[PDB]
């Protein structure tokens, strides 16, 4: 559909450029399409793009708050929870959901396999797809837990050390297993905070490079903190393309799922993690990593080979955004100022449809004893919206999980489970 394609394109463009900065020629270029054929003006296009965006988000909020997992309180917490991820985002869902990687047993190999799509943002507004095909196999001979089908929820943010001169990446991940409704000796090595060492030897199209990182992971909270330095000069590829290559052992497996943690069970001997990553319309990475304990440190030692890249493509030409975009509602909330009145009204109605959804959830949860809170639904809905808006925004400025963690902790406190 031509009209949908333009609106979809213009949303991504605004997600990155903003609306007032999105030019019409740049929109038809990236969309490969004219224009007044389908829209009266850029202003009318913007109203339509806004109404389309909020219609999809109201529907996403509706099925979460009225039909999601758990009770009304759990759904309200998830309304915050699904916004922590700032990596691999696109389209109507960008800034609204974590990235779920489906884990599956590979009994033939006594390990696990996965396949998933990573989406990088090209600075021109198009999206670089990266198809991951992954196999993991124990290094040791000891028995390993072979899991039933589940997934790992990945939430990541990339930042920079302001004192670091070298080409480098700061990477923070929150990773949680889920998908099963109702351990091992290796599990015991992860009860506390564990030093990490990462080493990558890379060769992409003949450009060699070495990446060396150090950090710590906290599996009880599914937390991973790394700072990775390119030790041979400029990284000849965009840092976002190495994120998945540069520790699923640090995932938080909830109590009822401990029998399905293959990654901790293979420890301390460890496991081999192999991938092919197919970059659409470009080349591919093949990676081989040993993840294992060396003394008290968890080591991820990696070799990487890339063949078939375009020297002027998105990867070798460094055309990839380093940061996530976040959501459009926050990106454009930021933009009211120069907007037309018809589009000022469009955000107003979009933000109010969200608040109304939060209010119904608070009211319904009261009535069915999912939750108690001091205040009334509509006013409390507005406080929750504002907190959600400020926290996401401040999570983007600081490139950190802290604001949403603190905000979510606040929400658990004020939207309480009723006394027994």
Author numbering: 8 to 40, 44 to 192, 208 to 271, 275 to 448
Copy text from the publication.
Wild-type NemR contains several redox-active Cys residues and is sensitive to reactive chlorine species, including HOCl and chloramines, as well as to some electrophiles.
To inactivate the sensor, we substituted the key Cys355 residue with a Ser and obtained the HypocratesCS variant, which is insensitive to (pseudo)hypohalous acids and their derivatives. Since its spectral properties and pH sensitivity are identical to the parameters of the original indicator, HypocratesCS is the most appropriate pH control. HypocratesCS consists of a NemRC106S-based sensor domain (green) and a cpYFP domain (yellow) that contains the p-hydroxybenzylidene-imidazolidinone chromophore (orange), designated as “CR2” in the PDB. Asn95 is located on the connecting loop between the α4 helix of the NemR-sensor domain and the N-terminus of the cpYFP domain. Further inspection of the structure showed that non-covalent interface interactions between cpYFP β-barrel and the NemR-sensor domain are relatively limited.
